[PDB]
Structures are given as structure tokens and as C-alpha cells.
Amino acid sequence: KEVEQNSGPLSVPEGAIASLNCTYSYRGSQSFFWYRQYSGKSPELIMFIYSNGDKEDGRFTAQLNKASQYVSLLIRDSQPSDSATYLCAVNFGGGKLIFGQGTELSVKPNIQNPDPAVYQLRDSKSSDKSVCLFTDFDSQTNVYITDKCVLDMRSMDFKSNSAVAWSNKSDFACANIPEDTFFPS
């Protein structure tokens, strides 16, 4: 890759500052772009910069340094909508617009009073097929196991983290992590 970004995934809590950088090999590049991409969506432009120096647009500040062939993006007061894959694009002359490998940024919720627990959920009341739900843990916390996604109950102004796990062997104990995690029986 002729365009490289800082390797992810990156993790930042809501309200904190996030920073992404980007380097390129063609010293004669004249236009530089910062794109945002949600999961399963199209790249969307955040900012562009042509000249050396800083460029501020709301909570976003872009910095360009042609001498060091360096582009960066500063995000102040990180919002939940800032969670995306960030793509650096540099034009190498003509229509040769080259992108980086992308940097994944996750804006985590601020769980004030986490109550970590692992619950067992069955397909129906009479079914033995079940999954495991690790939920309500703090954002610093991180057989099949999924990644954690942030859930938002907008009607109650409540956010919570959760991960799901399952397996193929029968009587798979979900107890198989915060030390105060609740394991009901």
C-alpha cells in the first residue's frame, strides 16, 4: 500500500479526543481526503485539505505536512456516530486516487455503574438449545464468541455493552472478565 494509516482497531470513550494519522509515498501529492465508512455502507467524506497547516471544521481538525508526507485527523468530543472505519485518500496525480488500509474507531459508552452478568437464554421455554449473554459491563472490559456491540434504549436513555457466545456440545455451561460478574444458577 502506497498510503498507510495507523493500525487499528482504536478505542475511545465518548467525549474524549480521537486521533488518526496517514502517510503516503508520492511527494508530489496535492489533495488529501478523510472518509468515514459505517459497517456495510459507502465511504462518506469528512474533510479535504490541499495546503500545509491545520484545517478546523467543527469538532474535526485536519493537519497536512507535505515535507514529511503526513496527514492526520483530530476528532474532539467523540460522539457515538463517530464510530466507523476511517479511510485516508491521497491523489497520486490524475485520477489515481489511492486509499489507505483504513482504521477502525470505536466510540465506547461511559457506563457509570456497570453490573456485569452472564445470562443463559434458551430458544424457547421447553428447548435445550441455549446461548450465553455477557452484558452490562464497563467499556474498558473486552465454542464461539462474538464481538461486543453497544445497545441503546433511547426511550429509557440507557446504553449497555453485550457479547453473545454459544457452542455445539450439550449442557454447555455459560460460566466456561470482571471479577464481580454475576452468574445466576
Under the rule (CB under 8 A), what is the footprint of another protein?
Answer: 1-2, 5, 25-31, 33, 39-45, 48, 50-52, 66, 87, 89, 91-102, 115, 117, 119-125, 129-131, 133, 135-136, 144, 146-147, 149-156, 158, 160, 162, 164, 166, 182, 184
- What does 102-123 look like in DSSP terms, one character per residue? -EEEEEE---SS---EEEEEES
- Rounded to whole angstroms, the Cα distance separating 141 from 183 reads 17
CA distance 146 to 99: 29
Among residues 15 and 80, whose Cβ is nearest to another protein? 80
Radius of gyration of the chain (CA): 21
Q: Would you say 78 or 83 has its CB closer to another protein? A: 83
- Comparing CB distances to another protein, the nearer of 17 and 36 is 36
Q: What is the nearest approach in angstroms of another protein to the Cβ of residue 113?
A: 12
User: In terms of C-beta density within 10 A (0-12 exposed, 13-18 middle, 19 or more buried), how is residue 19 classed?
Assistant: middle
Q: Please report how close the Cβ of residue 1 comes to another protein at its closest, in angstroms.
A: 7
Instruction: Work out how close the CB of 40 gets to another protein at its nearest, in angstroms, rounded to a whole number.
Output: 8
Q: What is the DSSP letter of 182?
A: B
Write down the least CB distance from residue 14 to another protein, Å: 15
Give min distance, CB of 59 to another protein, in A.
20
Element (H, E) at 64: strand 60-65
